[PDB]
Design a protein around this ligand. Structure first.
Ligand SMILES: OC[C@H]1O[C@H](OC[C@H]2O[C@H](O[C@H]3[C@H](O)[C@@H](O)[C@@H](O[C@H]4[C@H](O)[C@@H](O)[C@@H](O[C@H]5[C@H](O)[C@@H](O)[C@@H](O)O[C@@H]5CO)O[C@@H]4CO[C@H]4O[C@H](CO)[C@@H](O)[C@H](O)[C@H]4O)O[C@@H]3CO)[C@H](O)[C@@H](O)[C@@H]2O)[C@H](O)[C@@H](O)[C@@H]1O
Ligand SMILES: [Ca+2]
Length: 585
């Protein structure tokens, strides 16, 4: 076996506790190199003559080039030292510990997870595990109050083509009026983009953190929205823009007026007063040269305190969590303290960071509960929309991404198809509803938390920002109701099958040729197999089905009963058809 490809570390995503006395450990090796991975462990202060505990690590998955082995160590002492025993296809074996590799156990040394502190057990809100989030971009969802529309508001139509500066009049009253629609859809939480006072249509350039934007409503209206959503089983998640403020933020206004004399100059990153010759801003902003968004010095204890007060204030209004804007650009300490603040105020308040790349550094348990899973989106785009990758590659990307973070984070990752910053998924699919639906079937059944971008459920399309922010289509005749019912059915199923919300995931079948992909969600004895025929042709496949897991399944989408013969299951799928096979347990 290639030792150069074997890896483990007693931290991060390769070793972390799932309870005060249980440690999950993982190990990767070149794919196919290891057939058996066992862990020999004991208390860190155990005498050398003491017997060692054994734990067999099962193969939790395989990506492009590695196999991932996973085991659970029972550590009643909460302190553990361990070594791996790896066996190859031909029986060759080697011990692997902190010191290195050796045929002699003691020479391999031992990895050590010093101590398991209860406070360090990554814990997320239970509800977040089985939730289906719906993203609402307020200026474009529903205009329930035409009297607060910004000046220049354009007419609400299906052929509307917005510009970066357009306004359509969407507001919070509109959201309230449409709660029956969201409730019928079955969503259990709403993620709102910024709703605080701001002169723009997107509101990411904050004028006042303590006020609902006038064109969206007021405090009383927001509170009514929170209460009405809650009674309909719908939670509220607000967008926290803590990386940067708007040029109209009171502290910045003071800087523009008093220059180096303002008491708030250190709340920002300023280079040379006068505060501005704007084309070449003399203060750091979000991205490049964006005068409206001066970056906040969150490292400044004063800035932090102010923002923490803002969070406290809104949480006092009954919200259920936060989506953190450009979260990877404010400091880690700020986030560790934020989590402590948030969880101390509401143990069930959800913290979701907005990071598009590998966010493992923020997902170890001391900061965010989850992140907007843009890498999940990349795989889905690649496999279902563009067809850049085949089923086996798709399987590998999914598995590799899943192994990047501890299971607690993976379990609640926000799996979106698109957002207000991308083109709509339908468009990515080139208008092919068949491709779109199979992707949605995957979104609704894969491991993680589904996030729906407003309008996708009724067939809206659009290029990226600002075209992805077209006013919501409310005319029934203009809505794709067939799609709407499809979403409704998938959402009801997700709520009915515990496997889909609290189960693990294992690849079932992956054939690069037929481009058919299948996985199994498991919890207890329940198994739900999802089969995806991502091809424009009718195909038949043979899936392996050991009788120990059942020999009869019910396709929950059609009611058809399928049966396995001698450990094999023959399925025939129409083009782009997906099946959700429940094993009746
Ligand atoms: O620039 C002139 C413009 O300035 C103001 O408006 C700016 C911008 O403000 C708003 O954008 C917000 C998003 O809506 C949020 O979701 C979020 O998105 C950021 C994200 O947090 C960043 O990490 C980054 O994303 C990168 C990603 O990190 C990277 O891995 C890779 O995937 O590329 C991503 C970019 O696609 O940028 C996101 C914003 O993207 C947009 O802005 C970029 C900067 O110019 C641009 O390159 C990109 O094409 C855009 O899609 O955080 C931002 C917070 O600002 C608002 O919704 C946007 O519509 C606005 O453009 C003024 O208000 C505006 O009048 C003026 O025209
Ligand atoms: Ca309005």
């Amino acid at each position: 076996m290639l030792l150069e490809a074997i890896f483990h570390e007693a931290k991060g995503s390769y070793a972390y506790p799932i309870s005060e006395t249980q440690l999950r450990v993982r190990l990767r090796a070149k794919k196919g190199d290891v057939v058996r991975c066992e862990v020999l462990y004991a208390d860190r202060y155990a005498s050398p003559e003491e017997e060692l505990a054994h734990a067999l690590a099962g193969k939790a998955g395989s990506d492009e080039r590695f196999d991932y082995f996973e085991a659970l160590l029972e550590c009643s002492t909460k302190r553990v030292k361990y070594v791996f025993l790896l066996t190859g296809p031909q029986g060759e074996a080697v011990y692997f510990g902190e010191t290195g590799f050796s045929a002699e156990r003691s020479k391999a040394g031992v990895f050590q997870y010093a101590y398991i502190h209860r406070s360090e057990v990554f814990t997320t809100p239970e509800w977040a595990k089985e939730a289906v989030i719906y993203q609402i971009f307020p200026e474009r969802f529903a205009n329930g109050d035409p009297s607060n529309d910004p000046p220049g508001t354009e007419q609400w139509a299906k052929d509307a083509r917005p510009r970066h500066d357009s306004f359509y009049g969407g507001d919070l009253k509109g959201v309230i009026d449409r709660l029956p629609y969201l409730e019928e859809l079955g969503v259990t939480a709403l993620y709102f983009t910024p709703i605080f006072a701001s002169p723009s249509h997107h509101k990411y350039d904050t004028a006042d953190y303590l006020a609902i934007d006038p064109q969206f409503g007021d405090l009383p209206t927001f509170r009514r929205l929170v209460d009405e959503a809650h009674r309909r089983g719908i939670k509220i998640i607000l967008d926290a823009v803590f990386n940067h403020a708007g040029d109209q933020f009171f502290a910045f206004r003071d800087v523009l007026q008093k220059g180096e004399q303002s008491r708030y100059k250190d709340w920002f990153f300023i280079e040379d007063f006068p505060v501005s010759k704007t084309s070449r801003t003399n203060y750091e902003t979000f991205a490049v040269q964006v005068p409206a968004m001066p970056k906040l010095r969150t490292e400044n204890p004063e800035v932090k305190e102010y923002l923490f007060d803002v969070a406290r204030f809104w949480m006092e209004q009954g919200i259920d969590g936060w989506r953190l804007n450009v979260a990877n650009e404010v400091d880690h300490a700020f986030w560790r303290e934020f989590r402590r603040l948030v969880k101390s105020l509401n143990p069930d308040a959800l913290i979701v960071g907005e990071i598009w790349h590998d966010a493992s550094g923020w997902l170890m348990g001391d900061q965010f509960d989850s992140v907007m899973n843009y890498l999940f989106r990349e795989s889905v785009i690649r496999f279902f929309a563009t067809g850049e990758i085949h089923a086996e590659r798709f399987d590998a990307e999914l598995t590799r991404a899943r192994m990047l973070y501890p299971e607690q984070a993976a379990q609640g990752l926000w799996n979106l198809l698109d957002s207000h910053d991308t083109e709509r998924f339908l468009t990515s699919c080139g208008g092919n509803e068949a491709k779109f639906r199979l992707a949605v079937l995957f979104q609704m059944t894969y491991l993680g938390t589904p996030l729906i971008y407003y309008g996708d459920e009724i067939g809206m399309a659009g290029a990226t920002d600002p075209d992805c922010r077209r006013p919501m289509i409310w005319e029934e005749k203009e809505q794709n109701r067939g799609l709407f019912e499809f979403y409704k059915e998938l959402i009801r199923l997700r709520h009915r099958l515990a496997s889909l919300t609290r189960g693990n995931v294992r690849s079932w079948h992956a054939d690069k040729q037929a481009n058919l992909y299948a996985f199994v969600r498991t919890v207890q004895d329940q198994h739900v197999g999802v089969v995806l025929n991502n091809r424009g042709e009718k195909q038949t496949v043979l899936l392996q089905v050991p009788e120990s897991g059942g020999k009869t399944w019910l396709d929950c989408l059609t009611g058809e009963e399928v049966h396995g013969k001698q450990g094999q299951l023959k399925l025939t799928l129409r083009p782009y058809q997906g099946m959700i096979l429940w094993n009746g347990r």
